[PDB]
């Protein structure tokens with residue numbers, strides 16, 4: 001059972017700007033997604049201090065980067081707090097509306113797309129390199145869900161029957177045909193070292209078979 005939703009107009013406008021604007025410094029997408037993972041890991045870690053049972057779904061707090069040239073996907077996996085169905089459908093986009101407006105005004109005043117994370121809407125920078133983004137997520141208080149969008153104004157949400165995750169979030173980037181450099185080990189290593197060197201969780205870059 002697949003539900004289809006419309007993005008808020010302001011978020012659809014943000015995604016169109018990210019897709020259409022000429023901007024060569026695309027590599028910052030990875031910093032933004034790793035930052036989001038780090039925030040999600042901080043959240044479950046903090047909550048576990050007053051309720052240790054929140055880690056019954058997995059004690060390890062980490063980030064994995066998994067390239068797959070056969071599928072042309074780059075997957076960012078974390079074992080953070082995860083997202084509820086309400087987060088996916090409504091809560092995150094509601095918060096993003098104000099950050100989007102501020103980001104838009106900053107761009108008109110001379111900011112550039114690399115500053116997107118300072119406005120809290122860094123997730124959407126995934127569309128600098130991905131034609132489709134799939135998010136698999138599991139929060140302790142909800143079921144495992146798959147969110148997906150190829151932009152164009154709509155996204156889908158369905159219950160996920162795949163491999164159970166325990167807890168956390170998997171962001172699967174279906175890369176554009178000309179963005180396959182982000183599947184190369186040396187390129188990902190370079191980007192992580194440049195932009196994400198002090199993240200406080202182990203980042204494992206998987207090797208292709």
Ligand SMILES: NC(=O)c1cccc2ccc[o+]c12
Nearest residue numbers: 036088092093096123135147
């Ligand atoms: N906005 C976000 O920070 C975000 C992060 C991860 C997955 C998502 C899925 C749908 C909407 O937002 C998100």
